[PDB]
Design a protein around this ligand. Structure first.
Ligand code: GMP
Ligand code: GMP
Ligand code: ZN
Ligand code: ZN
Lengths: 161, 157
């Protein structure tokens, strides 16, 4: 059920992170968008491949899912992010109308290997103007440990962008 | 020079509304008074809810200059950038933002109450360093007028 599906899709997002950093497409971040347990898009960060600083894993997955589904609203879909989404990605998640976000690692795990200290107030509940009502789940247990370890494991395979 | 490029971003907003590409928003990225990108919202054309004017402009500028950072460049936005767009402006390292209309002008004709704390100075976890100018006088009047003039010329998203 939900738990098994959640763990499977977060694991897919983590594997995308490893795949993308391995082939030089971008940093170690993956995202999977699912429609009633059917995968619509499975993507990783493409900033280096695309020369596009907006091509984070989550944005790339939204772009792909919307193109595939022929609609700009992903209201029947959920997104699994290997790492907590940044302010841009969390904004994109809002604009796409995704109904639920599950993420694996806290942003601090990426910041620990040198990524920008760039965290979404609306995800953490700390804004004045931007407020979220999106359903948000932070992974726990085995899936969370596997997600957090990505950054220490991939430190030397890529250069920070 | 600020009025010229703000006015070009507003012209883009009108053109994109007129051809059905997206909503009434445009953005212009410049390097030392040379236009590097001139775009409008492409959400409807591209079937892409991330294709706001500012994101589109960033993608096109990064392609034109063949690099992922625009630290020598400034962005002119016909309307206050949203949390997504202002985050993209942060990631692209643009050094200055000039924007025409406050978000309230767009909210007034039906867009989401969807405002970037970091732009307004109320971020906790997100703190901006880039220089931000809200237009005044004629530039503000032109930019606010977009929303009254385009009111029912496009589909909301
Ligand atoms: N979750 C995620 N974070 C990214 C990505 N690319 C860069 N980062 C950075 O990693 C940190 C944690 O999200 C922030 O500085 C992000 O901007 C991406 O594709 N996905
Ligand atoms: N500045 C700007 N706002 C947009 C655009 N598309 C939709 N909006 C919405 O307009 C409001 C003010 O930025 C927010 O709800 C935005 O999400 C765009 O392309 N540019
Ligand atoms: Zn991001
Ligand atoms: Zn925007």
């Amino acid at each position: 059920g939900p738990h098994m599906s959640d763990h499977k899709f977060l694991t897919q997002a983590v594997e995308e992170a490893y795949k993308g950093v391995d082939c030089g497409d971008g940093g170690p971040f993956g995202a999977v968008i699912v429609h009633n347990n059917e995968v619509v898009a499975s993507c990783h960060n493409m900033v280096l491949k695309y020369t596009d600083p907006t091509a984070h894993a989550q944005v790339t997955a939204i772009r792909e899912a919307c193109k595939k589904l022929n609609k700009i609203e992903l209201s029947e879909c959920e997104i699994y992010a290997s790492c907590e989404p940044c302010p841009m990605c969390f904004g994109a998640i809002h604009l796409s109308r995704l109904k639920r976000l599950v993420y694996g690692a806290k942003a601090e795990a990426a910041i620990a290997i040198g990524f920008d200290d760039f965290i979404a107030d609306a995800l953490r509940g700390t804004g004045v103007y931007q407020k979220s009502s999106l359903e948000i789940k932070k992974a726990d247990g085995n899936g969370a440990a596997i997600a957090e370890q990505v950054f220490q494991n991939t430190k030397e395979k890529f250069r920070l962008y």
